[PDB]
């Protein structure tokens, strides 16, 4: 889950 | 390559959307790019479901409102055999049960193409020849949050540690010289009210400012 | 009718453009209305050439950078059999020789419809049922040049002597009462840096403020  | 490009002016881009309080920018960046490629293929602009991606792509490595990546979304659309429309699978900005319906699919992809990392000219070529491109960037700054107009340039930006997915819909330049004051035309997913009607001009050919060319990709339709 | 309308959210409106130092607002207002009517007819939003209107519609009574009229622009399109895309016939903000080519045409019209003059309720009905509407206004005040946000109201505004063509893309109201603080949603052609990212809210139902409903029209496609 890196890009928010 | 053209001195400037703006796919919004050719019918490839849907109106600006809003992810609200959910970490789904990766899903809006992916639907943006697939909207453009589906338009290039069929001539029809159809808004695509970010919610379908948020609820259904955990197997591919996404985490819904807790984060994700555009390449994993395109991988999901390939493995799944389709993606539903925005209309039929509406956005609610919370993790919900996957309700993918094949009868409502309006898009497909066979995988995706990656732009060479860090290469702004490779990205320029992709934007000019393909259509809108999904990209990641460092948006972790109050200067971005309250951006209103002009070419955005942030000294504290990183080209390596990125935290937001957006869509490059074109590039351009200010003034009469096409070789200076260059910018990337970027569509955000914070609503039309944010920025410049939902868009931001990011400094172009200034050492990969904010990482725009670090992790760019587009779906193969 | 709806208490609010915003055609930008439905795919009818191209990005904000900039006429620069050429008195061609009439051509931007005309392409904006033709863009919305061609989108309604085909589902494809394609930017149209103001330069084609500036260089080619002198026979219809327009005067290029020296001014003109949206209705003469729609007459030129009907008489000429077509109008080129902005991509094929780029804007340079000066009067030049006509370069129209039918092969590059992406729009047509059979004439135009005039809204009842002076009737803001007639204009509200046309905006709600047709799409963006071409209108003329009194922009000859410094308060308009320096407008930034909020509902524009200029005490010295004329409803009869108009000097600028713009595009009404919707209407709405501020506050929680739909009859309170009403406004027209207007796209200008002075670039995204002017006003509210290129748009302005003009006071609505305040006696045809600034002449917004005096000379409104749209192309028939
Ligand atoms: Cl990615
Ligand atoms: Cl007119
Ligand atoms: N993000
Ligand atoms: N104008």
Author numbering:
A (entry chain PA): 447 to 450
B (entry chain AA): 1 to 221
C (entry chain BA): 226 to 446
Q: What text appears in the publication on this structure?
A:
Addressing the elusive specificity of cysteine cathepsins, which in contrast to caspases and trypsin-like proteases lack strict specificity determining P1 pocket, calls for innovative approaches. Hence, we set out to determine the crystal structures of cathepsin complexes with representative peptides of cleaved substrates. As a working model, cathepsin V was chosen because of the resolution of diffracting crystals (up to 1.3 Å) and crystal packing with accessible active site cleft. Reactive site mutants C25A and C25S of cathepsin V were used in structural studies.
The pattern II group (binding shifted to the non-primed side) consisted of structures of nine protected peptides and one non-protected peptide that all bound uncleaved into the non-primed sites. Electron density maps of the peptides enabled the unambiguous interpretation of residues from P3–P1. The nitrogen of the amide protection group at the peptide C-terminus was bound approximately 3 Å away from the ND of catalytic H164. The amide likely shared a hydrogen bond with the deprotonated His residue. At P4 and beyond, the features of the electron density maps became weaker and less precise; however, it was possible to model the peptides KPKKKTK, RLSAKP, GNYKEAKK, and EVCKKKK up to P8 in the averaged kick Fo-Fc omit maps. MPD molecules were bound to the primed sites of all structures.
